[PDB]
Amino acid sequence: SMQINLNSTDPVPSKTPFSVSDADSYNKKGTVTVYDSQGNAHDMNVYFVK
Amino acid sequence: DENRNLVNMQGMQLTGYPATGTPPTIQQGANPAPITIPNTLMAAKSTTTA
């Protein structure tokens, strides 16, 4: 479970093709840590784009 | 430190957001990394507007 407060005045981004590295495609990045069946930790990045 | 990090008086490093780019900006979409004051040189900027 994950709660988030997003800003309503935040603009649509200029650089339109979505990628991972360049930090002007998305609006917000958040990170959750989960654990697999053997106990190794994995990191899920969620990216919120208006 | 010797490696010029930021460290409290017991020997533990102070983590933070790193800085990349020309000019460098903050990347909140990154992993937390130890801050380091660098011994490098500033880079020149060619003239654009007079």
UniProtKB/Swiss-Prot annotation, chain A:
| Location within or outside the cell | Bacterial flagellum basal body
Instruction: State the family it belongs to.
Output: Belongs to the flagella basal body rod proteins family.
What's the protein here called?
Flagellar hook protein FlgE
**According to the record, which residues of the full protein are present here?**
153 to 202 of 403
